[PDB]
Amino acid sequence: GCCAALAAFLFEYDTPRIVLIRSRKVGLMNRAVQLLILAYVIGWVFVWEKGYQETDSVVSSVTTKVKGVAVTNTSKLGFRIWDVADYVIPAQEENSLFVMTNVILTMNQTQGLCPEIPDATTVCKSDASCTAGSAGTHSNGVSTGRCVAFNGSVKTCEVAAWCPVEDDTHVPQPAFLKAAENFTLLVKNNIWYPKFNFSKRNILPNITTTYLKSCIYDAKTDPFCPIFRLGKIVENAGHSFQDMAVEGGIMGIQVNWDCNLDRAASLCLPRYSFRRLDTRDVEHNVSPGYNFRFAKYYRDLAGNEQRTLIKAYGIRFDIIVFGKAGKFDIIPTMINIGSGLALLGMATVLCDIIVLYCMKKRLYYREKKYKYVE
Amino acid sequence: GCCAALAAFLFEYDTPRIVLIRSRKVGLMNRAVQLLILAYVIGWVFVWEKGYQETDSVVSSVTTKVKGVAVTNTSKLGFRIWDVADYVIPAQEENSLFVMTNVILTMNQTQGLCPEIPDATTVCKSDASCTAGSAGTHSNGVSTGRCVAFNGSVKTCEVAAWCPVEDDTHVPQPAFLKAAENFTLLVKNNIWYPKFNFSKRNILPNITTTYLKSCIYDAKTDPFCPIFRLGKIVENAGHSFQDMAVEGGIMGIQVNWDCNLDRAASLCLPRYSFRRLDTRDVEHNVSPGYNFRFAKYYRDLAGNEQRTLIKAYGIRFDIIVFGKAGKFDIIPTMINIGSGLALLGMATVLCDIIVLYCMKKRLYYREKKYKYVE
Amino acid sequence: GCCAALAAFLFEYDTPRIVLIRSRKVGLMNRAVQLLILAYVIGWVFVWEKGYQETDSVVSSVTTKVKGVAVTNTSKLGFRIWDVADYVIPAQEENSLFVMTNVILTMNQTQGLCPEIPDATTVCKSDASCTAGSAGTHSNGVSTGRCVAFNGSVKTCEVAAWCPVEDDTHVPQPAFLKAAENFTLLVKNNIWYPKFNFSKRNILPNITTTYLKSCIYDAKTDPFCPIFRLGKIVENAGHSFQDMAVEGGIMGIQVNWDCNLDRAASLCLPRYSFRRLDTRDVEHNVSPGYNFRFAKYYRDLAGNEQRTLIKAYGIRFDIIVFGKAGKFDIIPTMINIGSGLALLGMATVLCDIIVLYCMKKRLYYREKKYKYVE
Numbered sequence A, B, C: 001g002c003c004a005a006l007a008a009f010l011f012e013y014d015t016p017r018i019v020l021i022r023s024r025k026v027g028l029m030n031r032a033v034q035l036l037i038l039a040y041v042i043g044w045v046f047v048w049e050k051g052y053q054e055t056d057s058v059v060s061s062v063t064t065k066v067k068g069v070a071v072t073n074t075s076k077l078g079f080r081i082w083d084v085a086d087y088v089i090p091a092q093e094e095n096s097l098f099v100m101t102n103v104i105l106t107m108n109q110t111q112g113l114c115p116e117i118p119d120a121t122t123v124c125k126s127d128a129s130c131t132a133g134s135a136g137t138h139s140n141g142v143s144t145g146r147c148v149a150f151n152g153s154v155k156t157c158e159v160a161a162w163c164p165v166e167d168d169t170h171v172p173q174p175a176f177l178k179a180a181e182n183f184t185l186l187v188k189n190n191i192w193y194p195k196f197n198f199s200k201r202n203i204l205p206n207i208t209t210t211y212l213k214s215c216i217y218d219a220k221t222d223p224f225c226p227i228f229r230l231g232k233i234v235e236n237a238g239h240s241f242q243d244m245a246v247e248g249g250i251m252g253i254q255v256n257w258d259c260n261l262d263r264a265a266s267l268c269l270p271r272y273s274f275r276r277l278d279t280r281d282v283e284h285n286v287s288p289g290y291n292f293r294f295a296k297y298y299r300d301l302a303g304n305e306q307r308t309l310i311k312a313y314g315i316r317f318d319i320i321v322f323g324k325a326g327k328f329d330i331i332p333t334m335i336n337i338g339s340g341l342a343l344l345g346m347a348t349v350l351c352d353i354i355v356l357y358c359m360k361k362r363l364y365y366r367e368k369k370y371k372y373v374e
């Protein structure tokens, strides 16, 4: 009878048959193991590690602005003023910003033939060691193979390049824009969590416009002013701006957005940390510090092309935004609950082993627990 | 006998002893709870939330191009033509593109001493309130401490800067390049899923070259033309291009790649959404809109250095590509199956509680289910 | 008695009652299924797929430098030298680098009225087909509606643009900087795993400074020299530099950081792969290859504004850094163990089905296993 079988299946309750053993040690051990398992599952997984939540990564957009003006009066270049349009090269970048702190200038360059800068490699005699067509270590010109005089004292191999060639052997010390220590950087950060449809910006609602006009970041006093001083950024990373400015470097400004969305949206706050992303190693490094070469192109009255070659040393400021949001989800909760329910049987397994193999009445309990079908 | 024990272990089947109770209410409740648990585990975890899949994030590369030419005839700068090489500063960026829509120009600047722009702070009398060496709010020059005349009417403090100083108080209205509304942006997006070795590009196979020559994106009609009109991009975000162009802003073009790889590769399509990434708040904001300063450097016939200072207002277009792919994996499937198997015991627990503590024959079932070993 | 009940709960051990059936086939099948389940759970989940680990994504910072000098002697532009400050436009980018390999130059441009380049669309007769105000396909100027003569042979519609207009129909072949094949690229990569507080850089500790001065990457011989040759980068992606240099393209340099942190930190090494991120399709593509337009602005002696329009073809080199680190975690371990414990009951279920429905003594075992409470 299909109907009778269906009724029996629906109208009958099936439960396992249990055997109760009065044993103080085994009972206490079983309860202790179960308590340890429950303490794990609750405290470590749910309360501590937030095992009831789904996680989403952040999508960020960053905007940077710099302020400050520097004054220099040197011999080669004379009195000058450096505003933001001068020392930030280029005017706009993405999640990054380069401030020039030291420079080498080669002005009024022309295409032609000229001697190389004296050194062990370039110095030649009798036009013999020179080889035509070789770019050389400098990669600034192509050798012609004709020894020519650099000055009345020494003679060097000739190259076809922009002339006169750059002499980048003597980096100015102290740095040229050493007042860049005192400039301020404003970081505007807008974040987005697509999974939870949540957006926020690093300028908090209680940060007024009057406050932003005179605040400088300070973890203890002003932990939410998004305006930083470059010297103090470098200092907070454990380094020195003056030392770091002679050859340049890379600094990371690190914004952390690790906020739980089960709470008020006013508690999703950014945390700022600073880290140097360049390494000082004089045995396992190539191209230390940080610099790059760009050129300014002009025209002579005769119509020929001039250029000024700038080797710009400075500090690059990268803005690194990371973090995960968390919101309650039922899938991980049920997974953890089921896993704990499964793990609760380990206590039964261990206690059964102890009862059946580590007692004097281990043959009585074996007879009671196991029923043999001959 | 080790061999006999091994044979018994391998050649004997162990199954629990069950107790069958004829109870309509308890049986129906047990079946209902089990049905609810199974419905959860199947529908919500597998069918709905795709609990049988492994997920991978996308790796994207974006290429942007702009088209359009604008014509202006103003008094200060005269008749001019603005092609792509003019209003896109710089010519190439990464996942970003700036179109200049409004400008302030300061031409023929030189290093020297000049008065500051009149205002409450700069205006001074009798050369008393001026303090030498102070950069000031503008950060455009360093004060010398000598009151000088701006014009026949007012007198302002003197600074050492590029002169004449920029007057950025009167932003032109309407915007200067208000025809940028009508320009078109082409976005080429190539994505990669390293885990699944899957690549695709936003120009679909059925998109021909003839179609791309005259199509403009439209969600209802042309949802897969990757050519957008800037005015319509701003409109689709709920804003106005003309209002947004006076001071500038930031727009995000958001490409979503959320495709299931268990299906045909022709169904992994991009979805475009637009969002404004800058906030209009006149009480909790600093540096609103969007702009930056860059300079053009020239040389006077005498050899001195000139510059033109440009304050460029405009809209930045950021391309944001996100999404996850999904493919069937056995690990999550088995995890979910095991979790459901574990959860199926909650029905037994609850029904046992009801049977042993909420019935008149709760002492008969207790005697039947539990067997005491004295 | 509450105290007595608590003592009984704490001092009594409860274990299920089991039924032992002597059946060779069923016992062997049960053991086989259990062995298969255990083999899965151990080998595939733990040993093979590393199911005992927590995963974190990488945070990377990249720095690129190029070396090489090229020489060209053409008719239009004459003898020239191309150093890094010339062919890298702009001098610095983020996770990217553009090397210019081919160029079209339009020098001494001025604002004014001039004919369009002859073609099917622009060619007009009797000043009839011209429409004033139409930007046209070129988007280089705004039509005035006046037919004008391009030369003694043909006549074209007039536009207001920078003049003379660019003629970008004949791309030079072979490429203009075809010696860029032989340049070298240095990639410096510093990675960070915030979850595990782990940092490393792609220049390994055993890579000395002497080695970096002459090494070129080669997977078989020098798999950890971070200096690459551009021609060999393009070759290792399955393409040709000379063919790819005429119109340009996009190459991805892909750094993989997939290292297990349960082992020594000296085994977290980068793996380099190369992939072309642009597609060659002459039926479903728009704007093939890769190029962009930038301008150089000058001043005529009379004070008017000149410009040189450069259409720069070249190869963009994107650095793509991805990977996940893994460290032992207890949460996934316990989850997998619990899931395996739950799955071990499938063998019991299947064997019970076989015993109770696929035997001649299926009515004896049913009577033995199930005890009915009337």
Ligand SMILES: *[C@@H]1O[C@H](CO)[C@@H](O[C@@H]2O[C@H](CO)[C@@H](O[C@@H]3O[C@H](CO)[C@@H](O)[C@H](O)[C@@H]3O)[C@H](O)[C@H]2NC(C)=O)[C@H](O)[C@H]1NC(C)=O
Binding pocket: A204, A206, A207, A211, A219, A220, A221, A222, A223, A224
């Ligand atoms: C705007 O709202 C934020 C949100 O909290 C306020 O941030 C709070 O700032 C105070 C001090 O400015 C923090 O207390 C400080 O803690 C440091 C230790 O980190 C301690 O050394 C100081 O003596 C002081 O007690 C406070 O923790 C912080 N709130 C949170 C949640 O971290 C802010 O003050 C409000 N106003 C402004 C103008 O930002």
Ligand SMILES: *[C@@H]1O[C@H](CO)[C@@H](O[C@@H]2O[C@H](CO)[C@@H](O[C@@H]3O[C@H](CO)[C@@H](O)[C@H](O)[C@@H]3O)[C@H](O)[C@H]2NC(C)=O)[C@H](O)[C@H]1NC(C)=O
Binding pocket: B204, B206, B207, B211, B219, B220, B221, B222, B223, B224
């Ligand atoms: C190339 O292949 C794509 C792949 O599907 C085709 O996209 C399809 O485009 C049509 C309309 O162009 C979509 O139907 C439209 O849906 C909107 C609602 O979103 C409705 O308002 C319209 O009236 C129309 O019914 C269709 O959904 C879309 N396919 C998918 C999967 O979304 C495309 O048409 C093919 N051809 C070209 C030239 O792109």
Ligand SMILES: *[C@@H]1O[C@H](CO)[C@@H](O[C@@H]2O[C@H](CO)[C@@H](O[C@@H]3O[C@H](CO)[C@@H](O)[C@H](O)[C@@H]3O)[C@H](O)[C@H]2NC(C)=O)[C@H](O)[C@H]1NC(C)=O
Binding pocket: C204, C206, C207, C211, C219, C220, C221, C222, C223, C224
């Ligand atoms: C610095 O330490 C690294 C760390 O291992 C050393 O890398 C090792 O380099 C050798 C060859 O340079 C690799 O062996 C080679 O394998 C290829 C196959 O990929 C084979 O065709 C070659 O004949 C050779 O056997 C070795 O696998 C590699 N180590 C690892 C872990 O991959 C490096 O050699 C050390 N020294 C320098 C100067 O880098």
Ligand SMILES: CCCCCCCCCCCCO[C@@H]1O[C@H](CO)[C@@H](O[C@H]2O[C@H](CO)[C@@H](O)[C@H](O)[C@H]2O)[C@H](O)[C@H]1O
Binding pocket: A016, A030, A031, A032, A034, A035, A038, A341, A344, B345, B346, B348, B349, C010, C014, C016
């Ligand atoms: C000193 C302090 C001690 C504190 C006391 C200990 C606190 C922790 C008690 C945890 C008790 C767990 O209780 C335990 O639950 C499981 C189910 O989960 C029961 O297990 C029973 O039901 C399940 C289904 O639910 C069956 O598959 C199983 O064969 C059967 O034995 C055990 O019979 C019971 O012992």
Ligand SMILES: CCCCCCCCCCCCO[C@@H]1O[C@H](CO)[C@@H](O[C@H]2O[C@H](CO)[C@@H](O)[C@H](O)[C@H]2O)[C@H](O)[C@H]1O
Binding pocket: A020, A021, A041, A042, A336, A337, A338, A339, A340, A341, A344, B349, B353, B370, C008, C009, C010, C012, C013, C014
């Ligand atoms: C996120 C965590 C996931 C894991 C969740 C765990 C929940 C599991 C609930 C299990 C419930 C156990 O339910 C309860 O078990 C105890 C034993 O423990 C049973 O108690 C039984 O064994 C004891 C011990 O010998 C006897 O003293 C008692 O007379 C007998 O009835 C109760 O009759 C039952 O009501």
Ligand SMILES: CCCCCCCCCCCCO[C@@H]1O[C@H](CO)[C@@H](O[C@H]2O[C@H](CO)[C@@H](O)[C@H](O)[C@H]2O)[C@H](O)[C@H]1O
Binding pocket: A010, A014, A016, B016, B030, B031, B032, B034, B035, B038, B341, B344, C345, C346, C348, C349
């Ligand atoms: C009104 C409509 C109602 C629809 C009917 C209900 C549909 C859902 C039925 C789900 C049935 C689950 O069936 C249930 O399976 C578990 C195992 O998973 C069995 O459990 C049995 O085997 C497992 C191992 O597999 C042992 O650990 C356990 O101690 C033992 O009781 C239960 O004895 C049985 O009741």
Ligand SMILES: CCCCCCCCCCCCO[C@@H]1O[C@H](CO)[C@@H](O[C@H]2O[C@H](CO)[C@@H](O)[C@H](O)[C@H]2O)[C@H](O)[C@H]1O
Binding pocket: A008, A009, A010, A012, A013, A014, B020, B021, B041, B042, B336, B337, B338, B339, B340, B341, B344, C349, C353, C370
């Ligand atoms: C992704 C989902 C993961 C969870 C997967 C769940 C699968 C679990 C399978 C459990 C199989 C249960 O297997 C079946 O259980 C029922 C009870 O339900 C048993 O039935 C037993 O109890 C009932 C109820 O009192 C009696 O009417 C019946 O005579 C008795 O045999 C069957 O003898 C057994 O064949």
Ligand SMILES: CCCCCCCCCCCCO[C@@H]1O[C@H](CO)[C@@H](O[C@H]2O[C@H](CO)[C@@H](O)[C@H](O)[C@H]2O)[C@H](O)[C@H]1O
Binding pocket: A345, A346, A348, A349, B010, B014, B016, C016, C030, C031, C032, C034, C035, C038, C341, C344
């Ligand atoms: C030919 C080579 C064969 C190799 C032999 C097979 C190797 C694999 C053996 C795996 C044995 C698993 O052993 C199996 O463990 C489970 C618990 O996990 C026991 O299950 C028992 O305890 C659990 C709690 O722990 C109870 O919920 C359950 O109702 C009860 O039956 C089974 O009674 C036992 O059969």
Ligand SMILES: CCCCCCCCCCCCO[C@@H]1O[C@H](CO)[C@@H](O[C@H]2O[C@H](CO)[C@@H](O)[C@H](O)[C@H]2O)[C@H](O)[C@H]1O
Binding pocket: A349, A353, A370, B008, B009, B010, B012, B013, B014, C020, C021, C041, C042, C336, C337, C338, C339, C340, C341, C344
């Ligand atoms: C990451 C993996 C997660 C899964 C982990 C699995 C661990 C599970 C451990 C289960 C332990 C089983 O524990 C062991 O089970 C066997 C059956 O298998 C029991 O053996 C019982 O059944 C057999 C088979 O009929 C009889 O021959 C035997 O006389 C009887 O005692 C043992 O008395 C018990 O000690």
Ligand SMILES: *[C@@H]1O[C@H](CO)[C@@H](O[C@@H]2O[C@H](CO)[C@@H](O)[C@H](O)[C@H]2NC(C)=O)[C@H](O)[C@H]1NC(C)=O
Binding pocket: A073, A078, A079
């Ligand atoms: C920059 O420094 C130079 C000298 O280092 C200044 O030039 C001299 O200034 C003094 C004091 O005014 C005069 O007496 C000299 O005649 C100036 N010339 C020389 C060659 O010494 C210069 O003035 C400084 N910059 C500015 C803006 O004044």
Ligand SMILES: *[C@@H]1O[C@H](CO)[C@@H](O[C@@H]2O[C@H](CO)[C@@H](O)[C@H](O)[C@H]2NC(C)=O)[C@H](O)[C@H]1NC(C)=O
Binding pocket: A178, A179, A180, A181, A182
């Ligand atoms: C940045 O500003 C500080 C002042 O906050 C400068 O340090 C002071 O400089 C003045 C002269 O300008 C001295 O009189 C003080 O003795 C200095 N110390 C202090 C504590 O005020 C600092 O030199 C500036 N950074 C530069 C110029 O690079």
Ligand SMILES: *[C@@H]1O[C@H](CO)[C@@H](O[C@@H]2O[C@H](CO)[C@@H](O)[C@H](O)[C@H]2NC(C)=O)[C@H](O)[C@H]1NC(C)=O
Binding pocket: B073, B078, B079
């Ligand atoms: C840009 O506008 C100016 C005036 O706003 C134009 O210059 C005048 O044009 C009219 C009409 O051709 C002439 O009659 C005047 O002599 C011109 N000069 C002045 C001072 O008004 C100018 O032509 C416009 N731009 C172009 C390219 O024509």
Ligand SMILES: *[C@@H]1O[C@H](CO)[C@@H](O[C@@H]2O[C@H](CO)[C@@H](O)[C@H](O)[C@H]2NC(C)=O)[C@H](O)[C@H]1NC(C)=O
Binding pocket: B178, B179, B180, B181, B182
């Ligand atoms: C963008 O183009 C539209 C046309 O599609 C311009 O709007 C029209 O402009 C013409 C004159 O150029 C007027 O005659 C029409 O009445 C306008 N409206 C329509 C619906 O065609 C629009 O002005 C252009 N955007 C600019 C110039 O910024």
Ligand SMILES: *[C@@H]1O[C@H](CO)[C@@H](O[C@@H]2O[C@H](CO)[C@@H](O)[C@H](O)[C@H]2NC(C)=O)[C@H](O)[C@H]1NC(C)=O
Binding pocket: C073, C078, C079
């Ligand atoms: C670049 O090539 C041109 C010719 O293609 C060279 O100019 C000629 O060089 C030869 C050989 O020295 C002379 O005899 C001619 O008088 C030169 N002029 C012409 C018009 O042919 C030029 O020298 C080459 N570049 C350099 C740097 O020498």
Ligand SMILES: *[C@@H]1O[C@H](CO)[C@@H](O[C@@H]2O[C@H](CO)[C@@H](O)[C@H](O)[C@H]2NC(C)=O)[C@H](O)[C@H]1NC(C)=O
Binding pocket: C178, C179, C180, C181, C182
């Ligand atoms: C890159 O350098 C290679 C040499 O390693 C050039 O190929 C050689 O060029 C020389 C002349 O410069 C010839 O004599 C050789 O026969 C060429 N082949 C070899 C195997 O050496 C190659 O032309 C250079 N790439 C350029 C110029 O684009």
Ligand SMILES: NS(=O)(=O)c1cc(NC(=O)Cc2ccccc2)ccc1Oc1cccc(Cl)c1
Binding pocket: A084, A085, A086, A087, A088, A089, A090, A091, A092, A103, A105, A294, A295, A310, B293, B294, B295, B296, B297, C090, C091, C092
């Ligand atoms: N802010 S800016 O306009 O972008 C910008 C500012 C400067 N600054 C100066 O010339 C000041 C100076 C004077 C003397 C020596 C050294 C520096 C230079 C270049 C700038 O632009 C470019 C142009 C081309 C390539 C790149 Cl990479 C950037």
